[PDB]
DNA sequence: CGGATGTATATATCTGACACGTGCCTGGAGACTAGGGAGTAATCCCCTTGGCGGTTAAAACGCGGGGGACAGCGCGTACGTGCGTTTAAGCGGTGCTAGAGCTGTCTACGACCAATTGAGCGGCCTCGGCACCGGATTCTCAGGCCTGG
DNA sequence: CCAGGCCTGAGAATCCGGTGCCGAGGCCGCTCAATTGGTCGTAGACAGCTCTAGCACCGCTTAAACGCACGTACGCGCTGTCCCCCGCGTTTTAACCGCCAAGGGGATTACTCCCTAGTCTCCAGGCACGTGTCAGATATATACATCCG
């Protein structure tokens, strides 16, 4: 099934909660579209690298190891999922 | 009736969500978004639950760091409220396109 | 006797723009750029053969290293060039 | 009878030298036969792209010899080349001219 | 009659396993005898430092097991440890509690 | 089977804090940290051996790699610990 | 006559952006480098190429830092760059904790 | 010796960076930042020289240190 | 809209850096072997995808309003700009020597292989530290009343 | 007429004791990787030799830097307005948990073929050196733009 317009699943309360964890006291109403775009760009980069690793591995499933390698590629090392 | 003056609930939410260690994004919507982005590259891609959890952790950490930088920019602009120009400036200084 | 890419860079420059020359500093910069790209690609190929228990580095490894290193259109064109070169080498 | 590997692939960069570099860097226990050819092709394409942009800049500056300033102008004006070379600084290259509208009168 | 290389160096971390990892990683053609011992010593020192600060955090939070939150608190409270791990994300760790002074009444 | 540092980290933890335990997620994070530092040291030692045209990795190479990869106080204590361990190993 | 404040600044900006020549005096930079290295190892000799490389790197770094500082100043609705702008730029970039 | 980085030189660097107006304390701030940068790079270069069993700092050592800080330099050997 | 300060320009010049010819030696190419690694075909079974409903927690919507962003305005000062004087950077000619760079030896260090055995990994099971929770206790938060001003 | 208290209600955060549950931490069996003793080859430690270049010094020139005066543009504080997030209540919806089923691909094994490392042998591409010559930097004069008086 083709997936369309799933970026709205990151709702306004989710962005607000992430901002609150980041120390934000007041949030403007236009922040959510920019945050959705930024998250989309970041996810496209990481997923592109992950799919490159998966396709090299001659696999049809993405692995946590692939995501971790992609995040090292972006210099965003993640601890707790292997490596 | 009873009424908190604005700001108090925001500060309390800041404290609660900085004390907590739980993922703030709904798992099923995040998974659907990840699979959409993936099928934009290679069709018929399966995923692992650990892989989706890793992606969610990375995305939440990235967004929280970006929001810290945005808050710094907003305070620099003598503002309490964060605005999209703050995010744009933060990303430009970091070196993201 | 330091080994450089001076002759080959000069040949490429004369093949692209025959009426434009090159300076010694510019050749040094181009040599450094070629070297740096070479180590980037080779290191990402080694750190990609290591994660699949593969003792060998092949055209597939170099291709995925190019895809990981270079940006989009640049990697697409580089992959086309490498595929054409390997096809010519196999034919000849 | 000694046909060079570069001629066999229609390339200018040294396939044999790249093979020697790859084998002396110990990047892997074994090296495939197509890896040096692929590396030479990619390197030659990148050099050709950079040199073409640099020569265009040199012509725009009414000069017939590429200098580090021309190289840096080409790299900073090409989007993908600038993304590839972002933390890299070029000796005797300077910066792109950029004065924003706020500063301008 | 068999004394482990860890015991000779007075260490806990596996000198033999570190040796095997170094040789399998193909970092150099030849490996010295003191390289695995030195690397094991450095690794155990770093682990001891991180674990000591994490246990201090766990004891401060009136608990008895180290969790990712305690590890992250230790990392972000130690200046040199945070400098070493500035670009590292700790899963299930959250953020260090920090509210800017301007935002407070 | 999969190889981790759980036993060794538990021994170190019981040395430093005898009355404090550790969870599985914390062990995973510590194992990842140890592997990350091991790679960050071994790659640097390899590149220094390449730079100095030296086929071997020695305690001196690891000492200078540690000085390169760790901040000041950490490097000082790590060098002290490594020198002590190597001296003890040579004596025994 | 006297130029108004800003015209000479703009002409200097164009002049120093069209050029590719070092803006720091070579001998003072050499003395500063030697003074800094005196705190790491006594009796160090240097190479002219080494000092030139250090000078190029320092100039490039400072130019980038000043670009980011100007961005921050414009964000704060200012033409003047101030130490708080440099501090914010370094904080976002990651040099300052 | 830090005073050798004069106010006009910092102004020139700012102009190449695109600064139209400079405050007073920017010079002291710039001197401190430059000192930190040079300390880091020189520390790594001296470490490389010591590992080489030398006493002269070379451009290759400086270039390798700069590559460590994620800021490569083309023109001096790479 | 004048002028002086600058950038750009036309042209001579002179020049030193770039392009080309030449000799030699080192690294590249060809040939043959052999041996292990890659590709292919089968099979298992485990994990991933997909459908349902139910209760329910979170998202969505609406609304009063109050706190904050944003524009306008005036004041003082700090920075830009220009000129005279002073300081030392730059050049370049000399001398000295510490040390980079390479060579020769010989020896100790490390690779390598076979046999042995103990350490570490998977699996299992019990118990206590920790998540959850409803009564009690205290801690910030916000509107209000009569008196002090 | 304004404030500034304590008051004092009032939700929220903290403390505390109970109970229960499942994951931490220990034990057992086994297996496979670390250890050990021996041999062989060469990498490096050490000592000499040489000669590039790095350092110290001097003197002359003049170009950049310092100091000071003057003025005006801008940073900043304040004020008024209007609006747009915030907090809270009510309705909707689809996340989530549990359970089941299907099947597809990841892992493993086995077999075969051919691709590459290794070694030797020949000879020409590439590098260092020398030398010619022309694109460009420079000195200097000039037409052109422009921003402040």
Residue numbers in the entry:
A (entry chain B): 20 to 102
B (entry chain A): 38 to 134
C (entry chain D), F (entry chain H): 58 to 149
D (entry chain C), E (entry chain G): 22 to 126
G (entry chain E): 39 to 135
H (entry chain F): 25 to 102
Which passages does the manuscript contain on this structure?
The histone H2A variant H2A.W occupies transposons and thus prevents access to them in Arabidopsis thaliana. H2A.W is deposited by the chromatin remodeler DDM1, which also promotes the accessibility of chromatin writers to heterochromatin by an unknown mechanism. Chromatin remodeling factors are proteins harboring an ATPase domain, and promote the translocation of nucleosomal DNA by distorting histone-DNA interactions. We now report the cryo-electron microscopy (cryo-EM) structures of nucleosomes containing H2A and H2A.W, and the DDM1-H2A.W nucleosome complex.
A single-particle cryo-EM workflow was performed on the H2A- and H2A.W-nucleosomes, and both structures of nucleosomes containing H2A and H2A.W were determined at 2.9 Å resolution. By contrast, in the H2A.W nucleosome, the entry/exit regions are fully wrapped around the histone octamer, and 145 bps of DNA are visualized. By contrast, the entry/exit regions of nucleosomal DNA were tightly associated with histone in the H2A.W nucleosome, suggesting the low accessibility to DNA. The H2A Met109, His113, and Leu115 residues are substituted by Leu117, Asn121, and Val123 in H2A.W, respectively. Notably, we observed that the H2A.W Asn121 and Val123 residues contact the H3 Ile112 residue. In addition, the H2A.W Leu117 residue, which is not conserved in H2A, contacts the Asn98 residue of the same H2A.W, and may stabilize the docking domain of H2A.W. By contrast, H2A.W interacts with the H3 αN and α2 regions, resulting in the tight wrapping of the entry/exit DNA regions around histone octamer in the H2A.W nucleosome. The density of the H4 N-terminal tail was not detected in our cryo-EM structure of the H2A.W nucleosome. In the absence of DDM1, both RsaI and MspI poorly digested the nucleosomal DNA, reflecting the tight wrapping of the entry/exit DNA region around histone octamer containing H2A.W. The pericentromeric heterochromatin is occupied with H2A.W, which forms a condensed structure caused by the extended C-terminal tail of H2A.W interacting with the linker DNA, and the H3 αN and α2 helices.
